[PDB]
């Protein structure tokens, strides 16, 4: 683990209010001694870690997409077909109507079925695969410090999850993702 004992691992408590559960053994990346409800006792650690990475990645992509939509940056020809609305919910409904979101659903589900489900099943049957590992490093940015990249990915994904949730609810209240 990168910065083991300081950033992550055993004896690390990001929130000293809650005691670092014994189940958190410091073996998993992103282990900062936060599990007040002690889910780690019963859950399947590898499955839940893969779930966390997937949630974070989707949330990061969603943050980028929502920010571009609110800023008004659109691909050539997207405005003519879908519309010029900046509201995320209106964009979602318009794309569902046209068929864009349906195709994205189809292909995301195909990727899930053919890659994520088999990989998850093998990992839970003890393949040894790192959670969230698909070998997708075409640009080779992770060769230098894979562990540092892993921790950065997990933390950025958590922050993106919280930010995306906040943005959606801000849009609900004020009509703005910022919520300023």
């Amino acid at each position: 683990l990168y910065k083991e004992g300081s950033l992550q691992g055993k004896g690390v408590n990001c929130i000293p209010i809650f005691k670092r559960p014994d189940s958190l053994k410091g073996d998993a990346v992103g282990d900062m001694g936060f599990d007040p409800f002690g889910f780690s006792s019963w859950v399947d650690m590898n499955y839940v870690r893969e779930a966390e990475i997937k949630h974070g990645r989707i949330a990061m992509l969603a943050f980028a997409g929502i920010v571009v939509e609110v800023l008004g940056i659109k691909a050539p020809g997207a405005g003519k077909i879908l519309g010029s609305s900046t509201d995320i919910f209106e964009i979602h409904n318009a794309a569902v109507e046209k068929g864009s979101m349906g195709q994205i659903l189809l292909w995301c589900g195909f990727f899930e079925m053919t890659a994520g489900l088999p990989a998850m099943q093998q990992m839970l049957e003890g393949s040894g695969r790192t959670p969230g590992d698909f070998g997708f490093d075409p640009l080779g940015l992770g060769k230098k410090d894979f562990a540092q990249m892993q921790i950065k990915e997990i933390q950025n994904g958590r922050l993106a999850m919280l930010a995306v949730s906040g943005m959606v609810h801000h849009a609900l209240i004020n009509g703005k993702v910022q919520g300023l």
């Binding site: 079925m113 053919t114 890659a115 088999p118 990989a119 695969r129 590992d133 070998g135």
Partner: protein, 171 residues
């Protein structure tokens, strides 16, 4: 691991010796079904789809005299329906079924291990004596591409009412 899917382990039933075997079986259908049956099915689909795709393109280009009169200018699956009423599709199905009786016999020879999947010993021109493995890889690859292509052509026809080439000329 799997050459095609690097992060997934190589399927157990796929040794890699068969033509077109790149370890692509994320869902593990080979672990469910006998791989000889699956290979026979894949080669069959490949050949049928290659003939179907070439037929769609060639029907767009040219139509035999008399068949145009009988089908009234209909194309693709509409030609299918018209010529079913005509009785020509009936003859095609009769003789294809006659072939497929011996196809069933050959399938059980394959499952008994005497026959390689898809090997009907049909090479009158002797094109496979030079490099049979190379030709087999070509056949499998072209057949997969033809399966995808016939899918695309038929669904484009369902969308537009136009054949492959007519669509490409009138997108």
């Amino acid at each position: 691991m799997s050459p095609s899917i690097p992060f997934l382990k190589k399927p157990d039933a796929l040794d890699g010796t068969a033509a077109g075997d790149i370890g692509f079986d994320p869902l593990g259908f080979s672990s469910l079904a006998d791989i000889k049956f699956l290979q026979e099915a894949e080669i069959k689909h490949c050949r049928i789809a290659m003939l179907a795709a070439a037929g769609s393109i060639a029907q767009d280009i040219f139509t035999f005299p008399g068949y145009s009169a009988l089908t009234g200018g209909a194309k693709m699956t509409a030609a299918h329906d018209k010529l079913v009423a005509t009785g020509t599709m009936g003859q095609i199905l009769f003789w294809v079924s006659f072939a497929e009786v011996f196809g069933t016999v050959a399938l059980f020879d394959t499952l008994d291990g005497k026959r390689a999947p898809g090997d009907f010993k049909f090479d009158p021109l002797g094109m496979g004596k030079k490099n049979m493995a190379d030709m087999q890889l070509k056949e499998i690859k072209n057949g997969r591409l033809a399966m995808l292509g016939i899918a695309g052509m038929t669904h484009g026809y369902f969308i537009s009412g136009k054949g492959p080439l007519e669509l490409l000329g009138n997108f």
